Every structure is written in structure tokens, then in C-alpha cells.
Symmetry: C4
Subunit: 93 residues, 4 copies
Amino acid sequence: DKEFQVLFVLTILTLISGTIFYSTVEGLRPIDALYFSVVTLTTVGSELMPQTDFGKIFTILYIFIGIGLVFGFIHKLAVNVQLPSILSNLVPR
Amino acid sequence: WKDKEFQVLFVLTILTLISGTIFYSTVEGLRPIDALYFSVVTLTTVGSELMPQTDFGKIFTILYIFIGIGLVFGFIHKLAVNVQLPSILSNLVP
Amino acid sequence: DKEFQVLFVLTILTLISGTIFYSTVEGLRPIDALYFSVVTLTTVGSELMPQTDFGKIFTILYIFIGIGLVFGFIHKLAVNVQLPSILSNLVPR
Amino acid sequence: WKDKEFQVLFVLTILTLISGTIFYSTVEGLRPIDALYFSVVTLTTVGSELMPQTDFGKIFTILYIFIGIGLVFGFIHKLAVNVQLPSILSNLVP
Ligand SMILES: [Cl-]
Ligand SMILES: [Cl-]
Ligand SMILES: [K+]
Ligand SMILES: [K+]
Ligand SMILES: [K+]
Ligand code: NA
Ligand code: NA
């Protein structure tokens, strides 16, 4: 599935981009910048809110582009990896 | 190719976010960027660290979510197709 | 569409139930209890967190039952009401 | 009727939430009810007012979301069908 591979790579690149942005512009530790990016694009949300106007505008754009990529990856992960794995693990052998 | 469905979803989304920006900046007294941010993280379900302080703002937010959530995720989906397709196609027929 | 009518009534009943619960057990004003119920079941989330163990257990159960009802209603609202309305409003007359 | 798909999704969900309850109560030092609550509002995307305080807890949460979000919404959907069907059917063939 080349669609799954592309969504995987773009999701990785997206989370790297957010990690770099929030550590640089919002001053977060990289691990906190990564956490922020993940919980934002999965729509879980965080206690942390961007403090700068640049962070706020970026996050708006990051949200609209990133949700579609991340949930596209999550759907393909479920269908192509997790579902076949569960089915295989339910087979009596 | 021209994607009218995408173009209309884009227009509807932007109009919906402008309406929220106007409401929260005037009724809840937020800066425009904060009113837009609240509008976005509400309709995408990310969620705000801020809560409306007025009953009017709370009632508007409830209605805003039901009027807008479907439109916004419709737009996110069509945006995803348009943004991701060049990468997918470049990895198919280079 | 009787499926839409049922989901509508159940969503109303669900939000009334949450309004009554959070005002009684968590001491919220009714409007704040309603707000909490709505943003919780739409997964938006709130700054308010249940303080009592009863509120926490109820909210867990309310979330699992309520998300499915509310997003079922939202999907039918989009398909049966909002989409036809938008299409009708795009017709040149 | 027996809905094995629902039964398995239920089992997977409960096991996933137990794993999160154990992790957050031991690594992040939460009461079990708070660890379960965090686990639930994370995987349903409602979101927590609490953030993990340890790097280990932050890394686990990232992986937890990707391992669990799909399963949990699969379960929410099947639960919705089973919970709503009696009301729908009672309003069809009373
Ligand atoms: Cl501004
Ligand atoms: Cl406990
Ligand atoms: K959410
Ligand atoms: K959220
Ligand atoms: K939140
Ligand atoms: Na918060
Ligand atoms: Na908060």
C-alpha cells in the first residue's frame, strides 16, 4: 500500500516540523513540543497553549493540514496493520 | 482540475470562522487572533484552555459546535485529499 | 427518517441528563453543566474536570455512550438537514 | 443476537484501559480512578486537564494514542449500534 507509506512519511515529517516549531518559537523542550504536536493533531488537546501570535497562526494552519494527514495515517494503520494483526491473533492454532 | 466541492467547503469554513472571530472578539472581549484560535480549536475539537465567561458566549458556543463541526471536518477531509494527492501520485507514476 | 428523529430525542435526553448530573453532583450552574456535557460529548473538552469520584466514573460511562449518540446525531444532521440545505442554497434562481 | 465483533472490541478496549490505568497510576503516581480517567479522555480525544509530568509518561502517551485511538472509536461505534438499535426498532415495528 503506497498510500499508507506516503501517509506514514508525511505524518513523521509533520510531527518533526511541529517539534521544531514549538521548541523554537514557543520555547518548549523538544519532548514537550512533540507531545504538543501529537495531542493537537489527534484532537486530544493539551493544557499548553501557544503564547505567541506566530504560534497561534501556525497552530491554526498546522491543525487544518495536520489533522487530515494524521487521521489519514491512523485509518490506514487500523485497516492495514492493526486489523489484520488482531484477526491473525484471534485464529485458533 | 477544478474542485468546486473543495472551493465551497473552503468558503463555508472561512465564513464560519469569521463569524466566530467576530462573536468572541466582541462578546467575550478576546483579541481577534485569540477569537479565531478559540473558534478553530472548538470546531476541530482540539479544545481551548479558555472558556467563555458569559452565558451568551456559552450558549453561542453550543450552537456553534453543532452548526460547524460537520462542515469543518468535511473541509479537513477534502483539504487532505488535495494536499496529499501530489505526494501519493508522485509515488505512483513518477 | 426515523433514525434521525430517534438520535435527536436521545441526544436531547442525554444532554438533559448531563445537565442534571453535573449541576447536582459537581455543583455547576445548569448552564455550565450543559456546556460541560456538550463539549465533552463532542470531544472538544473543557477546562472543567469532575472533582468527585462519582463524577469521574459517570463521565467515563457518559463519554462512551454519549459520543456515539451525539456523533450519530451530528452525522444525520449533516446528511439529512445541513447538506440538502446547502445544496438548495447553491441553486441559481 | 450474539455480536462477537462487539464482544471482542469490548475486551480489547477494557484491556487497553487497564493497561493505561496501571501505567499512569504507577509511573505518574495518579490515583487509579484518575489514571483511568486520563486514559479514557486521552483515547476518546476529549482531553485531560492533566499532563504527564515525566518524559517516560509523555512518550508512553504518544504511543498509547496511536495504539488505542482506532480501537476505542471502533468500540464506541459498535456500542452505539447496540445501544441505539432497541430505540430505533421500537420506533419502527412497535
Ligand atoms: Cl489580533
Ligand atoms: Cl481510585
Ligand atoms: K477531540
Ligand atoms: K479535545
Ligand atoms: K483540553
Ligand atoms: Na485545559
Ligand atoms: Na486547562
